[PDB]
Design a binder for this molecule. Structure first.
Ligand SMILES: NCCCn1cnc2c(Br)c(Br)c(Br)c(Br)c21
Length: 331
């Protein structure tokens, strides 16, 4: 029969009304600079294979971050560069400063503005209830902007959120998985990190949209207010949905599958079972209760929905009572 089609309920046609060159990144011509304008100072990497470095612009002695790109198709290099140029100057979007190639190895690298980041595994333990509301609101500014610009981030997670806590500066980074939204397009479901994958990716529903980012944001919020990182801790993609189903219940999951006529992998038949939708009070205890409030639970519940159409938009999220005090202080 086939799956039922889907369209984003906001910013549906913003790319159609753009000139072709805005979203047709395969035709984008890159102007490569010389990496000899920057001297690498220290590896900021997280693994053996990442190539992120702190560097100095020798011309003006300003601190920057150099990301040496892994060998992927030239299309994906142009896609990330075009998206970074399209979003330049947006709220809490990382600023692309330069694009260079190593003269010897001809390896392409992206140069970004420097952020004095504190890693989330050390920062989140210290965040007050107000800090979480403040930083969630800052992420929502970046998400509403890039969604309004016809772009899905598709890899929202704490590792991709740089925070200068001293200056309360937040930047959304790592746009190498980001894509342009086009109504009716079927996208690859092998995106985002496992613990932040939306149900549509896990059940192989390809006609998704910006609301994928809002599920990932819901996973971040749940880990922060409940002090459980990550919140849905699956062992693989199949077990990831099982972890979700033990919290949100299987009834809404099978309703979601029936509504879009999604063909469920036969492996999910045995492992999913039957589970009720749990109340969020079950995850509250004396170590996290100071971060949990009725406003936080109401907001979180509206992000973590199987049906991507029923999740809050970034704009709707920014108007939730959970952020009333943050909006007041900003004005
Ligand atoms: N844009 C891709 C993200 C790459 N990346 C990895 N770790 C990073 C750190 Br730490 C800082 Br600070 C900055 Br700025 C960037 Br950019 C980082």
């Amino acid at each position: 029969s086939g799956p039922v089609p889907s369209r984003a309920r906001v910013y549906t046609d913003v790319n159609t009304h753009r000139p072709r060159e805005y979203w047709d990144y395969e035709s984008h011509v890159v102007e490569w600079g010389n990496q000899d304008d920057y001297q690498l100072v220290r590896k900021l990497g997280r693994g053996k294979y990442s190539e992120v470095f702190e560097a100095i612009n020798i011309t003006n002695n300003e601190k920057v971050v150099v990301k040496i790109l892994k060998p992927v198709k030239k299309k994906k290099i142009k896609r990330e560069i075009k998206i970074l140029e399209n979003l330049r100057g947006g709220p809490n979007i990382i600023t692309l400063a330069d694009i260079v190639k190593d003269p010897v190895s001809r390896t392409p690298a992206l140069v970004f503005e420097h952020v004095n980041n504190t890693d989330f595994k050390q920062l989140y333990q210290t965040l007050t209830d107000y800090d979480i509301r403040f930083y969630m609101y800052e992420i929502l500014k970046a998400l509403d902007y890039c969604h309004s610009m016809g772009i899905m981030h598709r890899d929202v997670k704490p590792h991709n959120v740089m925070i200068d806590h001293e200056h309360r500066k937040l930047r959304l980074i790592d746009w190498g998985l980001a894509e342009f939204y086009h109504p009716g397009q079927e996208y690859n479901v092998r995106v985002a990190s496992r613990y932040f994958k939306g149900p549509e990716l896990l059940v192989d529903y390809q006609m998704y949209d910006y609301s994928l980012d809002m599920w990932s944001l819901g996973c971040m919020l749940a880990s922060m207010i409940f002090r459980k990182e990550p919140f849905f801790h699956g062992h693989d993609n199949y077990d990831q949905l099982v972890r979700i189903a033990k919290v949100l219940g299987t009834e809404d999951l099978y309703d979601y599958i029936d509504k879009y006529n999604i063909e469920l992998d036969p492996r999910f038949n045995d492992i999913l079972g039957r589970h009720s939708r749990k109340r969020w009070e079950r995850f509250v205890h004396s170590e996290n209760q100071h971060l949990v409030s009725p406003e936080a639970l109401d907001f979180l519940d509206k992000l973590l929905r199987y049906d991507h159409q029923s999740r809050l938009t970034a704009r709707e999220a920014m108007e939730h009572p959970y952020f009333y005090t943050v909006v007041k202080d900003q004005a």
